[PDB]
Ligand binder design. Structure first.
Ligand code: NI
Length: 341
């Protein structure tokens, strides 16, 4: 059965609700982004209308085989009517293709569903500026003040400088970057660009990147691992065993690996500046965990919500415990008393 925080009252619509079978009364299923917790249940046998971005549409067609007749892509920043209701898709600053959805209900209520997002001041000059929002369905992944991390630009600066230094000291070092989903592509793309290399990967991961509308992609990536000195590997292989095993396969081309594991937040954030991050090292293998987040920090979330001033907030993450729900409700009430809405 479909929970309440995935239904849009007064419409036939759901959001990110494909794991419950046929939802009673649902005439249109919205997909915010192509992350497995959110698409859970879609396949080539799905026969209802799916509304989403162009990029999410390319991934449902080519990776999940959903038939073309049921894929409904919408452009961003554009007023659209779906089954009698005005909707707008906005960039969520999450992974490629990810959106927030503005719904203009027939009774005059306006609802924003953030999907997954990384709040930014630039969102204060989208189509959100123009009018009031009564209900906010909010990505609360990091809704507690301990959750701090740097900007994506500082993190990428660190990774570029680390890789360029190492390969300039040792032209025989290989760089490896872990992945398990779409998102965070800037980590491996910026490193390969400083090194003057394409990024090497499996046929399956190449397929996924080819769906993403990245300009000049054919100039940036390849399936020919032998010619490339930046390789992608599944995240589960980013450990001393998996990496040893990978260097053997390269046939004595390389004598050192430097690897990156993008994570979300970890507790080493609470004591260490990005500058001061150090790897784990065994022999000729070094592994850096870097806090590249595609979700809002506490401070970014708080700024967005204090600016939007919604009448009601419905969290969509961390909803499973009484303590989580109570904690989030306390912070929504401080934010509201501090800003005066
Ligand atoms: Ni996500």
């Amino acid at each position: 059965t479909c929970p309440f925080y995935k239904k849009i009252p007064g419409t036939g619509f759901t959001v990110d609700a494909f794991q419950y079978g046929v939802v009673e009364g649902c005439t249109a299923y919205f997909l915010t982004h192509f992350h497995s917790d959110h698409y859970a249940g879609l396949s080539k046998h799905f026969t209802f209308p799916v509304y989403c971005s162009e990029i999410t549409g390319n991934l449902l067609k080519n990776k999940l085989h959903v038939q073309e007749q049921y894929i409904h892509p919408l452009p961003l920043d554009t007023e659209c009517i779906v089954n009698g209701v005005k909707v707008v898709l906005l960039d969520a600053n999450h992974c490629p293709g990810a959106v927030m959805i503005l719904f203009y209900l027939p009774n005059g209520t306006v609802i924003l569903h953030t999907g997954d997002f990384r709040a930014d001041p630039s969102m204060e000059r989208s189509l959100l500026a123009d009018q009031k929002v009564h209900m906010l369905y909010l990505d609360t992944t990091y809704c507690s003040p301990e959750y701090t991390f740097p900007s994506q630009q500082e993190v990428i600066r660190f990774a570029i400088n680390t890789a360029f230094e190492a390969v300039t000291l040792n032209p025989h070092a290989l760089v490896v970057c872990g992945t398990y989903s779409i998102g965070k592509e800037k980590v491996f793309l910026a490193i390969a660009d400083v090194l003057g290399s394409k990024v090497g990967m499996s046929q399956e991961k190449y397929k996924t990147l080819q769906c993403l509308n990245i300009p000049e992609i054919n100039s940036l990536i390849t399936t020919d691992m032998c010619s490339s000195l930046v390789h992608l590997l599944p995240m589960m292989q980013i450990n001393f065993k998996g990496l040893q095993s990978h260097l053997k396969k390269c046939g004595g081309k390389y004598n050192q690996i430097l690897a990156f594991r993008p994570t979300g937040w970890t507790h080493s954030n609470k004591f260490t500046r990005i500058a001061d991050v150090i790897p784990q090292t065994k022999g000729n293998i070094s592994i850096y965990g870097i806090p590249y987040s595609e979700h809002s920090s506490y401070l970014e979330m708080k700024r967005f919500v204090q600016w939007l001033k919604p009448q009601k907030i419905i969290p969509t993450v961390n909803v499973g415990t009484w303590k989580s729900r109570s904690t989030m409700e306390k912070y929504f009430r401080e934010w509201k008393l501090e800003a005066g809405y």
